[PDB]
Structure 1
């Protein structure tokens, strides 16, 4: 009897090969997410869990799964995992600190370009068969000579700033914890207050985690500050914005556009989360969406899976996992 490991979502077969000598595997090698009932059934006597974005762990989950030694999260933002409750039950909780950063940064910039240049509608027009040559339309907004404001300047903020260096924009940021002035200057970043960031930015790129303090940070009052036509890009967590306020800002035309890779409906730890994305937001023309594909780059996903696998194996071996969030004796 090897320790039992439940992997809640599909992974590369070579990751299964890496784990199999050490672990009895209970896998989900499909593109589907299992019911919460079935995850509980599988994890009841599991020694370990590899968890993904659709997963949620609270005290109630853990009491129902008394054999767990480690939850290895193949993700960065562990807002749906109660770390304190894990520590209390003697369960390691591990994450992936760096591997999701670059592909998410790349996508966020592509969304900003895609949103500013009306890519969805432009591509729709070409596919329709009615392109008859160059026309005066689909006039958009570029990054050259624009002010780009970042809310947050951790891993993804810095990766995005790195990638905008050749782009002719004026970069500013708001943080809970400032960069050192030397790094600011190497990247051409100026630190500003949050109100000013929203009042003065042509592109607003969110790069902050979801917590009690950032929940609905981007609300109606903050959005009412933006320059008419400002573009808002959300690659972080859905619930840092109030999507109802975002939609209202779009409909009034104060917000020029909203691009998102993440949605309030995904933030499982939120009882008052909406059950879906508002259909009126989904149908609004001044939008561009992706289904949480920030890290959806083939080579990176394998590396992310390997990182979670390694952390789990470290825990099961009686070591402190390299990427543990918590501390155990």
Structure 2
């Protein structure tokens, strides 16, 4: 009797209980992305699907699941979705507002601190048991007094600036669209060009989306005209920074270190691609700091993203117009 909702990725147990009131829930009890064949097989008679970023909902998917009334994306975008095929197929598609900006600003500040202060190699040096007290090693660079440029004064770029206010730094920013007056002084930031930002900075933090336009914006050329011994911190998307241009600038001492939350291997919509992170980056524990796309891996934030995709599903199955709907099925 109950509609069925298939969840393709693990969710908190409260959201499954929330969904059970009006649907029978087929969760993914693993922390693993199931293969597209196993997802389609589960969704085939499902009234609803909660979709995550591995899911690519095309007409092929939708024709394998003719009972689909709603796809509730736990995503802020719809790139991997055929919005009009969902419309043609009488399938509400819903999305959730951006709850990822603060957890990604916070993490970006984490990568900056961990990498400029050698915190990983310092943690390894404690695990090894050889610690006998302070030594004149792992000397890093400080924050106060330094110049850090934000390439991309967006949502993330903003919250970063707001969160470095107390750090007595000198913040620059290179963006296509400038900012107003009040914010530019509120969070003491200054506008400047890419060749000038990139040349006059100690730490470079790109916050631009991935486009057909700006890809490898940080390439061999960009890296060459920065301050020697600078630091590159990349929590935007993978293919914006040339992981091989930094393999060389690492060995040549041009930049002091690279921290990353993303990798070009992480982009399947891209037709250029190595299936692994460069092995020379993965062996350079002394100048690199890496997280596996953990920008929004905060329990509270994921709970709320999940909550909203679940509400979208409960509204659509109830006959209501769902709040995240970006679509009008007939």
Preserved contact between residue 219 and residue 245 of structure 2 (Cα < 8 Å): yes
SS of match in other structure, 2:166: coil
* Residue 97 of structure 1: how far off its partner (Å): 2.7
Preserved contact between residue 50 and residue 71 of structure 2 (Cα < 8 Å): yes
Preserved contact between residue 75 and residue 100 of structure 1 (Cα < 8 Å): no
Aligned to 1:38: 38
TM-superposition CA deviations, 1:243-296 (whole Å, max 9, x none): 222222222221211111122222222232321211211111210011122222
How many Å separate the matches in 1 of 2:196 and 2:67? 50
Aligned to 2:305: 304
Preserved contact between residue 94 and residue 327 of structure 2 (Cα < 8 Å): no
Preserved contact between residue 115 and residue 259 of structure 2 (Cα < 8 Å): yes
Q: 1:70 to 1:235 in 2, by over 3 A?
A: farther
How many Å separate the matches in 1 of 2:73 and 2:150? 26
How many Å separate the matches in 2 of 1:255 and 1:83? 43
TM-superposition CA deviations, 1:161-204 (whole Å, max 9, x none): 11100001111222243322221121111122223222222111
Give runs of aligned pairs for residues 82-121 of structure 1, distance below 5 A. 82-83=82-83, 86=86, 89=89, 91-121=91-121
Give runs of aligned pairs for residues 156-167 of structure 1, distance below 5 A. 156-167=156-167
RMSD of equivalent CA atoms: 2.3
Q: 1:15 to 1:229 in 2, by over 3 A?
A: same
Larger radius of gyration: 2
After TM superposition, the score normalised by the length of structure 1 is: 0.90
Preserved contact between residue 56 and residue 269 of structure 1 (Cα < 8 Å): no
Preserved contact between residue 217 and residue 241 of structure 1 (Cα < 8 Å): yes
How many Å separate the matches in 1 of 2:303 and 2:41? 27
* Residue 72 of structure 1: how far off its partner (Å): 2.5
Aligned to 2:324: 323
Aligned to 2:5: 5
How many Å separate the matches in 1 of 2:164 and 2:182? 18
Q: 1:257 to 1:55 in 2, by over 3 A?
A: farther
Gaps of 5+ in 1: none
Aligned to 1:219: 219
* Residue 73 of structure 1: how far off its partner (Å): 2.7
* Residue 306 of structure 1: how far off its partner (Å): 0.5
* Residue 4 of structure 1: how far off its partner (Å): 2.9
* Residue 70 of structure 1: how far off its partner (Å): 3.4
* Residue 63 of structure 1: how far off its partner (Å): 4.5
* Residue 83 of structure 1: how far off its partner (Å): 4.7
How many Å separate the matches in 2 of 1:88 and 1:248? 50
Give runs of aligned pairs for residues 259-298 of structure 1, distance below 5 A. 259-284=259-284, 285-298=286-299
Give runs of aligned pairs for residues 53-64 of structure 1, distance below 5 A. 53-64=53-64
How many Å separate the matches in 1 of 2:117 and 2:84? 44
TM-superposition CA deviations, 1:72-122 (whole Å, max 9, x none): 332345544455655565544433333222222111101100000111111
Preserved contact between residue 79 and residue 210 of structure 1 (Cα < 8 Å): no
Q: 1:143 to 1:320 in 2, by over 3 A?
A: farther
TM-superposition CA deviations, 1:118-137 (whole Å, max 9, x none): 11111111222222322222
SS of match in other structure, 1:216: coil
The total of aligned residue pairs comes to 328
Preserved contact between residue 120 and residue 289 of structure 2 (Cα < 8 Å): yes
How many Å separate the matches in 1 of 2:225 and 2:86? 40
How many Å separate the matches in 2 of 1:192 and 1:85? 43
How many Å separate the matches in 2 of 1:267 and 1:155? 22
* Residue 307 of structure 1: how far off its partner (Å): 1.7
Gaps of 5+ in 2: none
* Residue 310 of structure 1: how far off its partner (Å): 1.6
Aligned to 2:203: 203
* Residue 213 of structure 1: how far off its partner (Å): 2.4
**1:178 correspondence with 2:178:** yes
